[PDB]
Amino acid sequence: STDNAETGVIEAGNTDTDFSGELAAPGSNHTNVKFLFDRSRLLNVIKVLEKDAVFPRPFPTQEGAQQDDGYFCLLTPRPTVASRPATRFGLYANPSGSGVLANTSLDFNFYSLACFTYFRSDLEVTVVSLEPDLEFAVGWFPSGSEYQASSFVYDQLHVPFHFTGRTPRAFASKGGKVSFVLPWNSVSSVLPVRWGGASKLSSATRGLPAHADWGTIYAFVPRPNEKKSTAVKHVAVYIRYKNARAWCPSMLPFRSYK
């Protein structure tokens, strides 16, 4: 039917608008935002700590630095690099060379349907072992907080301070899993799926949000430093969005024709 798309508004019609027919009855409400994002998906795979760690230093990190890489998981669907917020998402097509291969993550599913600018929800976290008969624990600190390093000595054994604290620590049974829900805890009101600002007035990276996350989790072995092993253990981190809400329509990623 006659219209003018230049207006910026085009009404959705049906078979009977210009032709002869009727409306098809509604088949489902699966496009409902709350229902759609309310399901677990893989966020990242991290190594399990077997001693107190040294949190990765800020960028740019110079050669010779002593730190633990691939252990901390930033809870966010946004791109991350080496446990920190990121803008560009990267991977390694040529894993051959010199230098540490930074861990990167991205909620692929989230962005394939994130046709909006802002998002908010509580976060259900599930940690699954990728190792046989593993006994591990999970640690977590809020957005804006940090990992408490070092350790204390009990009976000449070094026990990392990450065994204690005021934040959630979940000890799984041998071969078991860990699961719990966290509240939106960032100081921001909503999470910017895409962002155009800057978190600092000087030497800031445009588009890089400072606290677009639900905090950080890590996994460790309920054993003292001394009883350390040599074989690196891995654990998978799953997240689920509870009571999700979204604002300001936006685009979905470009699909190549090649």
């Binding site: 006659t2 230049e6 019609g13 608008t17 032709f19 098809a24 677990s40 009101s189």
Partner: protein
């Protein structure tokens, strides 16, 4: 005393889509209010209804800029009894790939309802002409002729004061839902074709550009619905 229980065979199972909550680990948290924020979206259909541009390979004559896909169709001056452009009513077809309807729909297994094609004439205002838009349900052979298109669902669009024309592709199917992706070609995943014919050639006065362009948009009709969330295709990151 203790309540006798009988844990089931699936005890300790982790189901990624379980319709229930889990234990809170850090409760009693109040969050900054979000009343100040306008534009809240309740259902993705609200976005699928917004028409967005389709994409066509520029007629075998690309621009020195790789990946030459265009959101319009230039109307050639030479007469030819076949469609100016045509595409299948198969949601996984590349012409819908980057439209919101197509992008969103590709993340569900089924759809039900009408798809809407919107055309906008972008030639000069002094131009005149008529087009015949048609939709043909599946047939053994795809229609090409004006005489064939004219026997299917169609509407004649006249160029004039108003620049656009919306065309609703009726939902004509044997099943109440249709496949969103044509993994296997069948009457449940491919529903015929939409085609555009120039009815009467475009007429222009002297000193007017030739080959006016027609912009193509696609969106969900008002009775359009999507069912069954499926795994996404992560390739957009490669």
């Amino acid at each position: 005393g203790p309540i006798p229980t009988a844990p089931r065979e699936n005890s300790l199972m982790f189901l990624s889509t379980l319709p229930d909550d889990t234990v809170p680990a850090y409760g009693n948290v109040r969050t900054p209010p979000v009343n100040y924020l306008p534009g809240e979206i309740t259902d993705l259909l609200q976005l699928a209804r917004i028409p967005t541009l389709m994409a066509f390979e520029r007629v075998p004559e690309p621009v020195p800029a790789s990946d030459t896909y265009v959101p319009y169709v230039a109307v050639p001056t030479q007469f030819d009894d076949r469609p100016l452009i045509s595409f299948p009513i198969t949601l996984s077809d590349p012409v819908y790939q980057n439209t919101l309807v197509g992008a969103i729909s590709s993340n569900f297994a089924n759809y039900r309802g009408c798809i809407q094609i919107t055309l906008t004439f972008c030639g000069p205002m002094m131009a005149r002409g008529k087009f015949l838009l048609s939709y043909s349900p599946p047939n053994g052979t795809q229609p090409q002729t004006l005489s064939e298109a004219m026997q299917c669902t169609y509407s004649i669009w006249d160029i004039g004061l108003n620049s656009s024309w919306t065309f609703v592709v009726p939902y004509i199917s044997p099943s109440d839902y249709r496949e969103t992706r044509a993994i296997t070609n069948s009457v449940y995943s491919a529903d015929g074709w939409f085609s555009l014919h120039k009815l009467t050639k475009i007429t222009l006065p002297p000193d007017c550009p030739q080959s006016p362009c027609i912009l193509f948009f696609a969106s969900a009709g008002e009775d359009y619905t999507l069912r069954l969330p499926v795994d996404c295709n992560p390739s957009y990151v490669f």
